[PDB]
Design a protein around this ligand. Structure first.
Ligand code: FES
Ligand code: FES
Ligand code: FES
Ligand SMILES: [Mg+2]
Ligand SMILES: [Mg+2]
Ligand SMILES: [Mg+2]
Lengths: 589, 588, 588
């Protein structure tokens, strides 16, 4: 198995030319008890990028699991080095945690490339830490492997399942409809988080962790294990064993993250009822590995049926999903219908197909068979028009009442027209949504603008807007929704999302006005404002709607270099840098 | 916050011996504690840590302890974590029942010998809960129990698989050749999915509920599964409360009255608890100076089964907790006047006030008293010419068993069985499938030499299964009798804890294979049909052999341990009471 | 290396019991251990953890245990950490001496009753080193000692303050009024500047040096200050080497020969070690089935004082380590043919190959054997009519003491003094300055009722200081005699460990205040000049009283502890040897 190699660590700890610098490098790494024989025996230094902390409750389980990773690395013959990254906690980070993925990315590459690190174990959980980690590891391109934290346990409130995130959106409706009070709202929310781990619905965190499995970047079965199961700590051990293997065999990210691998992830996202936030993230990771993912790569997957019976699209939560076989069971379903490139290489050292043998699900209540699924055409639906060149709609989440109301008229199905109610940001929506002067009814479409990477800044999860109270009290639970921002992966709103280019850089949403008529055609992928070419340029000369001034040093940088979610809201200058571990850096003294 | 003058101050602020105060304070600062911390007069809160790598059922406390410390600090105490002697019931051989008294001795020493004003007793695995309470009673400084909690539900092939109970059910399946040997090892592993203790209503679940029923933990502390966020929140609230108990000076002997033990006896019956609760409750009471007699157990025989949990019922710890846990069970008993609700608890309220609003939320799990899972779920006390005290696990009689033995016409509750006697569990596993014994469905399987003295430490070996050939005919259980114990996770309706045991000359010593036993659950009698003349002839042959004492502690144990009917205590130790009423000598 | 059937496999891989294998395996995985780990056949390495908040001298081990774990894993073993009974010498009352045998009992149970193949014994505070080694020997599985090391140097007003020694020096500065009560407390505080044990050549520093001397720990592991990175590097190395010892089956009884204890006895004398080493070394020897007699102590008497460390000398643990530590001190002993340099050690090499190259690098701290600090530094045994064994701390005889009592031009080393007799230390503090006693420079202060049965657990109360009026006259110390002990940090040339102690009828029971005692350091005699007739008449008046037994463990101790001369062991316990050669029964 193990044929020796001169790891880049050896350029610090056994440098041929400079023996002064070598001694300078060994000296302090021994100040808490590491012996010289450890740092000088030619074992690989395995970094562990720690994401858990008191400020990051979704990832904090990695504070206890890190010990299992250390044990794996040491049994298998490496030397572990745990170190931190910029923290990211989506629930409390303001203005939004989307700001942090790129900032964490920058700091991880500096560390991975700047220290005597050979391979890495990326610890992941909360929404944006999985892409931030993978993005950084590929730019540097040293052998990497993802270790997922896992979701929380099932939450219960009065004998009822209660999913993280989705409990907030359902409780916003019942509090408006006067069916719950302000303390039941807080208490149902608290019941949604019964343990350590990330959101327990199929939101961004469960999606991005299933993605890394589909991408072949973590061991089989890693994504779905709930954080407090001992399975998770066993998995953390085996991941520590595996990463030294990947260091010796020299299996880098750029060997794994081919376009075919990204197409596998795309397929998985759709079959699993995954989050629309997966789209900016999968593109961002693709770009940073020099792969181009286009709007046609998403249309490819639209006709994947929904097969996992998990909130927000379905019924159960992360525990039932993982007991049913989690991501490998979903991938197996797909592989059987030829929707997977089964011959890609994975960090297991086998091929996707080889990994998936035996992974047929064990709970058909939870993971449905491909041919008798839960819903057809569950993939994202990219939409085009005069309002934006690209956006996606959460097809997996169209309710049957929503279907009957808009997508069901006898001659024209999948097509409907609605009256725009436009809001400039989240605060705007909350202040005017119940203003009867706007006379809102069942044939309106709620529109929000200024919530993109530039407008907010960092795109914001504010598109899952709810009907005004008077409509909620009539039983109308959702109206169509559209905006240039995002929504929580836990939303059960069939929104049109991630509209690029956003309003704030002169996308079509900059000139739309309340009372206009929007025409949605889901058969053809088109969404248009019925507003003539002449009126359009009259509005355009009034200028772009206003957006808040820059507030922090990082926001100035972000607003300067961030792309649109079309291409993954990436630091556009940064994609250029590839395989940085090929060249060494200069000595520091 | 009065403040009072805590015994710790005799170490850290003694105005007689200033040299000693300097000597006592010096080293306690060598990891960064400031003098204001130890010299301000805040109480020192000992935390008795039971969790370790070798104690996986209690290891959750390695994490929880930081929540306890935060609560002590918020409330104005100074925490002081220290360990006790490790106990891990599954791997400790010859038996972990040796360890309960050894852990008692050490913990008494630590609490009395050091400047500790009040203790948080972390509990979990079988024996850790009585051992902590016994010790905290003898020293009698303010004390509170913090339970660890069960593991989460175990699943294998979409079936609920319970800690411990899987092993016994797997033993019957492997013998009937229905599962492989790596499948046995497999489903055992499926039953232990997380940190925590046995997720069935075993000894840990029973004993931790008993601590709640005694009044020694905050309401709802017993049942919270170990990995729940709620368990961490409970550990914080408990750290707060122990500081208060230090100031209000609420001590074990203030709480462990005869009524509180009667309440605990009610709950064990209602909850389908382990029969190992019987020795542990008699031990705890003795060390508190309270007498628990066989008639106190008989008083709880007619309490109905209330909780629908393996091994007696269906679900595991997670469902029991979500339906209300121990408070929901105590609420049921309170409504029927089966509880003394006026007793004081460590919450600062009476049991009755703690229980208001605690009616269950899930009647599939915690049945109503008046239409329950089954009636007469209490332990049934048996006596006769083979022992003066044994109990039968009533809550666990199945329908086939009640048909085959308990339903003789005109004579219901009385049956007779032909004894097949084994000396140790090795002897059982060697001759149970020897056809020479010609075992029928009307035999009683008997094991002896497994009590406190015989094994030594009583051993969980009485849940013997039928021979291979009976299991293939659909006979899943014969009646069983022994002077040892069984796992609280057992679903055998055994007659257990037979005192006096065979090794000190109880009736089991002269029983022979072939003898007939007449059991009658109406009279409470269990008697071998052998005439006094033949008994005498047999007695003269001497007592059957038991192994030689093999470690120093076994020798101490064999010399001082009492019989299970009196708690298996160190007999000399129960005379020691309220030790914190007297300060120890200075050490220099 | 060559594979082995470790005893753990009897749990994790049983041939005839797959049910028990599943039951033993399942819960050991509930915090993430994989089946590949517990079934691969790698040895299971116990780590006997002694640190905690209540044990500040050993607390360093809670951060070093990770180093130990990493080394066990780099070497192919599976680490299993677990606690023992906590011991903290400074605060434990009535004495930490009661704990050594208690800790001993629990660790035997743990090592024998669980699947442990080899153990690392973390040590530090006084009693933890003998207690560990005693238990590892009784069970006799491959063992190794990891020492926590002493605290950093203490400075107070630009002066070295040593742990412990600063207390006894301050008690004199307080009666002579040179310091206030609150600078006493700051002075003691300055003595403890970091983690670690006492930084003087007290019992901790002695016993860890004894451990290395016996070949039970790696070369140079003893004197490394706890906060040094050398100490975590040593813990890693120790984790590695214990795996090797497990495969090579290098058991305690292979190492602990009479030749090894003799090497230890030499090192103690040569280093000015604590008198407490004598009962601990005898205790370890007995548990190793080795006899160590008063003659073997005499054989070390004439060894010079080589180490310039408080109490006897000047420096503290830091300078001693920088000078090459116990290796340098053994190297001296080697070249003068005072070691058995070819005994086996847990290093693989023999003691001679261990010390090749270990000559001290600082002759200001470790002196050459032939131009030494002082001569005849070993303990000096004394027989007599007051006791059949005692020892005197020859190493701390100062200039004035030698002049005032040991320098009669006729017969040097003989003197006679008047006995002032106190019954326990409280008697001392309430009468030492009672002027009706007429105490002068020619009195001997005597304390009794302070042995194993008397106190109970021998107490450190013999280093009594002169009355206040003698201290103001410049007399810094008088002869001191007792059946108790004294801190190994004490600079008192006391006569200690008197067996038989008073409380069981030894000579000190009949001796009275005012009697004349004659000591002869040339014959090793100490006698109370009182005639046989007065002795018999005083015995009729009864042994002087002692406090009643107060805790359950005290009753066990008083009923089983031996005398300090035979090691203060539980005498019934030394007959148990090589326990790991028999397996315990299965628990279910
Ligand atoms: S808050 Fe971190 S996963 Fe949703
Ligand atoms: S083994 Fe610890 S509770 Fe059953
Ligand atoms: S107090 Fe622990 S070493 Fe002296
Ligand atoms: Mg999110
Ligand atoms: Mg048990
Ligand atoms: Mg001492």
């Amino acid at each position: 198995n193990r044929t020796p190699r001169r790891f880049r660590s050896r350029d610090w700890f056994d440098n041929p030319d400079h023996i002064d610098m070598t001694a300078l490098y060994l000296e302090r790494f021994m100040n808490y008890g590491i012996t010289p024989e450890e740092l000088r025996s030619g074992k690989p230094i395995i970094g562990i990028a720690q994401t858990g902390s008191d400020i990051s409750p979704c990832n904090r389980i990695h504070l206890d699991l890190v010990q299992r990773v250390r044990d794996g690395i040491r049994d298998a013959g490496g030397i572990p080095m745990e170190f931190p990254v910029h923290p990211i906690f989506e629930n409390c980070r303001r203005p939004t945690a989307a700001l942090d993925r790129n900032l964490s990315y920058l700091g991880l590459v500096e560390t991975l490339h700047g220290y005597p690190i050979d391979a890495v174990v990326l610890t992941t959980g909360c929404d944006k830490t999985t892409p931030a980690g993978i993005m950084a590891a590929t730019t540097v391109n040293i052998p990497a492997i993802v270790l997922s934290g896992g979701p929380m346990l099932d939450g219960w409130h009065e004998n009822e399942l209660v999913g993280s995130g989705t409990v907030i959106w359902r409780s916003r409706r019942k509090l408006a409809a006067g069916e719950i009070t302000e303390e039941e709202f807080i208490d149902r929310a608290a019941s949604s988080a019964p343990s350590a781990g990330h959101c327990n619905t199929m939101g961004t965190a469960s999606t991005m962790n299933a993605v890394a499995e589909a991408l072949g970047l973590s061991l089989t079965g890693c994504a779905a294990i709930p954080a407090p199961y001992r399975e998770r700590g066993q998995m953390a051990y085996k991941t520590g064993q595996r990463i030294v293997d990947l260091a010796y065999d020299d299996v880098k990210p750029l060997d794994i993250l081919t376009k075919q691998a990204f197409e596998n992830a795309i397929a998985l996202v759709a079959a699993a009822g995954g989050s629309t936030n997966a789209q900016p993230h999968i593109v961002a990771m693709a770009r940073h590995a020099g792969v181009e993912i286009t709007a046609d790569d998403w249309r490819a997957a639209y006709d994947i049926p929904l097969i996992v019976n998990m909130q927000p699209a379905g019924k159960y939560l992360g525990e039932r999903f993982h007991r049913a076989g989690g991501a490998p069971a979903v991938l197996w379903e797909l592989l059987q219908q030829g929707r997977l490139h089964g011959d890609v290489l994975t960090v297991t050292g086998k091929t996707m197909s080889e990994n998936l043998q035996g992974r047929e699900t064990s709970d058909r209540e939870v993971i449905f068979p491909y041919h008798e699924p839960l819903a057809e055409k569950a993939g994202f639906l990219v939409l085009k028009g005069n309002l934006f060149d690209f956006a996606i709609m959460k097809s997996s989440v169209i309710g049957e009442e929503f279907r009957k109301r808009y997508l069901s008229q006898p001659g024209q199905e999948g097509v409907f027209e609605a009256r725009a109610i436009v809001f400039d940001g989240s605060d705007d929506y909350h202040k005017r949504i119940n203003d009867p002067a706007l006379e809102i009814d069942e044939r309106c479409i709620l529109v929000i603008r200024g919530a993109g990477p530039i407008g907010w800044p960092g795109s914001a999860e504010v598109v899952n807007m709810q009907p005004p109270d008077h409509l909620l009290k009539k039983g109308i639970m959702s109206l169509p929704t559209l905006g240039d921002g995002r929504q929580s992966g836990t939303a059960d709103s069939p929104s049109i999302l991630n509209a690029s280019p956003e309003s704030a850089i002169g996308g079509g949403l900059s000139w739309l006005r309340t009372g206009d008529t929007i025409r949605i055609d889901l058969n053809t992928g088109r969404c248009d404002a019925l507003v003539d070419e002449a009126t359009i340029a009259a509005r355009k000369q009034d200028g772009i709607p206003a957006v808040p001034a820059t507030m922090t040093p990082w926001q100035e940088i972000y607003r300067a270099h961030a792309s649109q979610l079309d291409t993954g809201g990436v630091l556009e200058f940064a994609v250029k840098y590839q395989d940085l571990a090929a060249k060494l850096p200069r000595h520091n003294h």
